[PDB]
Amino acid sequence: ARKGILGTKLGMTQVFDENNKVVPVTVVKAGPNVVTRIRTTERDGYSAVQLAYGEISPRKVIKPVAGQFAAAGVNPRRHVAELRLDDEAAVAEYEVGQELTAEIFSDGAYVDVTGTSKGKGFAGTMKRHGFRGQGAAHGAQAVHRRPGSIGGCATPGRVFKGTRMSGRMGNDRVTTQNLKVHKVDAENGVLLIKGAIPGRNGGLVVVRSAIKRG
Amino acid sequence: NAAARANDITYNRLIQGLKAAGVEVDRKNLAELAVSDPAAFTALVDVARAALPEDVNAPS
Amino acid sequence: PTYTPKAGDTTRSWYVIDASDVVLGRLASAAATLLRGKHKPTFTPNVDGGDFVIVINADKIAVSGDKLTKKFAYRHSGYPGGLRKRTIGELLEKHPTRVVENAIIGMLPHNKLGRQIQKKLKVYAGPDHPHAAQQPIPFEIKQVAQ
Amino acid sequence: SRIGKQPVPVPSGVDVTINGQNLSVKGPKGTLTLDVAEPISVSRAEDGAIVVTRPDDERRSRSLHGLSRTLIANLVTGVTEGYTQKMEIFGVGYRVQLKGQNLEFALGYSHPVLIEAPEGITFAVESPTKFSVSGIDKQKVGQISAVIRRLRRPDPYKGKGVRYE
RNA sequence: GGGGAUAAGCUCCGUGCGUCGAGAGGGAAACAGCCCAGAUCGCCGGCUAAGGCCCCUAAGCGUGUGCUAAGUGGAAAAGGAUGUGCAGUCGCGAAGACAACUGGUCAAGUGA
RNA sequence: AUGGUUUGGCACCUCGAUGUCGGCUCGUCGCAUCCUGGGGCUGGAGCAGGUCCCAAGGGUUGGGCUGUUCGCCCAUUAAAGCGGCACGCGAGCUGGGUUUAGAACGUCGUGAGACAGUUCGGUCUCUAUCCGCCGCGCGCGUCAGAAGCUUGAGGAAACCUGUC
RNA sequence: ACAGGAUAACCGCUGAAAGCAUCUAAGCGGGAAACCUCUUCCAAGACCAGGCUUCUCACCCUCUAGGAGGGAUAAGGCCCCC
């Protein structure tokens, strides 16, 4: 069914396709993943596979995590994340200790990359919500960037919740859908994905088969 | 009312029957009997049932 | 003076009510009476000296008229246009226990003591319950003749 | 009501099984199951029929009596010999044929049109212009005939499309 | 009763009319002017008024005979309408009534 | 017959202060639907309309003139909807209009002056206590103390459309 | 977005009361950017405060031993530090 892998955003570069068009590609280190646990309906109520990724010194792991990894039967990894499948038929193709690499995907496939958006800090309504500012001249008094009105006058009497105002921005999980895989370099465990994927370089991402275009 | 329904009788019929039987215990001591001496409350329920008419809905 | 319950005076029992083909309002009223403890001569509105009530077969419950597809359960999220409505039909087919829970909870006082009394109500959509260790007493909704 | 009072004859060759209100009949064509409304009971008349006994004369019962009787009559006549629908086309260029268990029409659309045969029915196509469907239940036959008839919007101007006889 | 568009929670008069003002208590969800009833104080006594008696909430998922399918009950008109209960009429009719298929089959009610 | 979206009528509300129009910024709701969606009859041949139903998810332009709303016009567009909410929104902004004091024209008055007539000019104050809302923490709880990975009751977002 | 579910107006099937008929009172189907799923995100303070696992899994003192209080630790965490 839906495949998936844990990886790292390396950066963006340029390639040219066979028709000489240029393709902006994000390079993802779809490094080797090891299956650490299988979630089954008979035990957990849902079907899922849990993958581990990244390298860490064994002295950096705490005793509970090391115990979980030892019970699974593999050496610890930095990152652990779960892939939600649909049914046990889709869970039967994974077993603990199995190694997942970048070649599970193919050239021209469609993927959904999930990462953590870049942080923006405390942002104003103009940046956080695209509010049009007020005028820069013609008498406007210290309202060049302020939101303006906030509600009604009597019948509202309050501010409706969900009202868009300034606050913290970014640092949220974001999924980009229907990205095309331009090339699957099997030597370096590298995926060439056309477009921009969420997060900063060196961030952790999950690449999954697209849910709409697949 | 709770103790009367525990004896298969409603509060209103029980009060009517107690009034008919002529017993003059007020609701305070009736509740005291209901909580403390259930046997006495059952006996009073019996006498109230005895004092009631045979057809309570009759135009009597 | 009038009797007042002390610390260890309250004693609780377990009842189970089979909701199969029982009118929703009737069962809800009976269960509310049992939960409040109104059937005990030692009742006190101050105290929750009620009993534990188990309701099984909640999906088999009886609803008269066309209330199955014409009575709505409402809830507002707090956001504008946050009003959601489900009829008793889909509410029964999705969350069978919720109909009985809502009906019973609407019939007991809305104080903090009512919130405490709510904790002693368990409803189950199946014919069985996990409370066999308490040995519940089967309960029948009877009417005292006057 | 008047129809409801008349018992519907049961042929000797059809096995009729009555379990409360759930009624099942095993005819030469096949078996079809019916449920009778609660206020009106059905008992197999020993003289080779069944009894449509309506005990009350309240509006619901007096209205359901004839309905139940005619439903049972339709059931028996559908389980002995089945039911058959006869269809045809009017116009030019409209061709129809049966592709195994599925039906394929060419009304002139940019795409071929497929019709799926549900259980209990079969498709008869002796000519492109005229074809037929038969089944053991009248209701499914009627519904599928209506569905197949709907393949063209009505034409009060020229009359191209399909129509019942 | 007048004025106003007999509209106003409009205004102006009459009333051994009431209440509030200056009146607590009970009821009407809340509710100066509506209903019951006029608080000297105390009581962990009783009987009632208005209003009530499935649960919230004290007391009836009261009894008997009927009606309603509209959640009517639990807001509204002109008007529209093969809903239904009861009662009253008339027309036609076993010489076979109505429907269905002036004459034939058929089989009790059929029409306003 | 509805409505209080129009002018009204009453003066119960405030004169020990309830900002008066448009515009900007930001909304939210109704459907009496402008486009897109689904149908019905056509005095519908097709196209295209007429007209009537259902439908509120999203969308619904930029300019000239005027302080304007309104309006007329210019280019477009799938379309350039109608309304409620102190005719939403000045402890969010403006001050062009109206509504002080200066000055002038016409008209009225003997005159001081006046004109729901015109004309030019003319101070828009405040460090947010509480509720509300947008974000971020601290404490306790979840029947020992911890740590990974999670299910989701329940909510929020998004929903447009053209040409070939 | 695709797909599914239940529907609006509407199109119907099988037919009673009302011997016929009648998309209807019994039923069964189709049917929309509306509704429920479906897509993305938050979410157990969800007080019914959930689940699957893994780690520690122990040591004293005091009053009167009924409970409490105090101290020292483990797994782990925080402060200081880059």
Cross-strand partners of A130: none
User: Measured between alpha carbons, how far is A132 from D26 in angstroms, rounded to an integer?
Assistant: 76
CA atoms within 13 A on the CB side of A33: 31
Q: How far apart are the first and last CA of chain D?
A: 31
User: Measured between alpha carbons, how far is D142 from A98 in angstroms, rounded to an integer?
Assistant: 57
- Which of A158, A160, A163, A164 to mutate against chain C (most C CBs within 10 Å)? A160
Give the dihedral of Cα atoms A115, A120, A125, A128; nearest 10 deg: -10
User: Measured between alpha carbons, how far is A138 from D16 in angstroms, rounded to an integer?
Assistant: 93
CA of D143 to C1' of E109 (A): 38
Q: What 3-state class would DSSP assign to C74? A: strand
What type of residue sits at position C22?
V
- Provide, for chain B, the percentages of residues in helix, strand and coil under a 3-state DSSP scheme, each rounded to the nearest 5: 65, 0, 35
Helix intervals (H) in C37-95: 67-70, 88-94
Question: Whole domain around residue C123: which residue ranges?
Answer: 1-146
| Interface size, chain A vs chain C, as Cβ–Cβ contacts under 8 Å | 6
Q: What 3-state class would DSSP assign to D165? A: coil
Which method resolved this structure? Answer: cryo-EM
Q: Tokens at residue A124, please?
A: 């104003």
| Cβ within 8 Å of residue A131, ≥6 positions away | A125, A147, A148, A164
Phi, psi of D158, rounded to the nearest 5 degrees: -115, -35
| Best CA proximity match to D90, nearest among D154, D1, D15 | D154
Q: How far apart are the first and last CA of chain C?
A: 31
Q: Do B13 and C42 touch (CB under 8 A)?
A: no
CA–CA distance from C63 to each of A200, B3, C59, C95, D84 (Å)? 58, 32, 11, 16, 42
Q: With touching defined as 3+ CB pairs under 8 A, do chains C and B touch?
A: yes
Q: Give strand letter and number of the nucleotide nearest C84 (CA to C1').
A: G35
Interchain CB contact of C81 with A (< 8 Å): no
Spell out which residues of chain A touch residue C79, defining contact as CB-CB under 8 Å. Answer: 160-162
Spell out which residues of chain C touch residue B8, defining contact as CB-CB under 8 Å. Answer: 144
Q: What 3-state class would DSSP assign to D16? A: strand
Counting the structural domains of chain C, the total is: 1
CA–CA distance from D22 to each of A105, D25, D26, D33 (Å)? 57, 10, 14, 7
Residues D87 and D128: beta-carbon distance below 8 Å? no
CA of C90 to C1' of F14 (A): 52
Chain C, residues 60-79, CB within 8 A of chain A, namely 78-79
Tell me which chains share at least 3 CB pairs under 8 Å with chain B: C
User: Measured between alpha carbons, how far is A9 from A116 in angstroms, rounded to an integer?
Assistant: 11
Q: Which domains does chain D have, with CATH numbers?
A: 15-83 (3.90.930.12), 84-164 (3.90.930.12)
DSSP string across A141-191: -S-SSS----S-SSSS-S--TT----EEEE-SEEEEEEEEEEEEETTTTEE
Q: What are the start-end ranges of the E strands in chain D? A: 15-19, 22-26, 31-35, 41-43, 51-53, 83-90, 95-99, 102-106, 113-116, 121-124, 130-135, 161-162
Nucleotides of F under 7 A from a protein CB: 24-30, 41-42, 44-46, 57, 85-86, 88-90, 92-95, 125, 131-136, 146-157
The residue in chain C having the minimum alpha-carbon distance to the alpha carbon of residue B37 is C41
| Best CA proximity match to A53, nearest among A91, A11, A100 | A100
Spell out which residues of chain C touch residue A160, defining contact as CB-CB under 8 Å. Answer: 79-80
Q: Which residues of A87-99 are buried (b: 16+ CB within 10 A; e: fewer)?
A: eeebbeebeeeee
For chain A, the structural domain boundaries read 1-214
| Best CA proximity match to C50, nearest among C60, C40, C65 | C40
Question: Going by DSSP bridges, is the β-strand pair C14-18/C52-56 parallel, antiparallel, or unpaired?
Answer: parallel
Q: What is the resolution of this structure in A?
A: 2.7
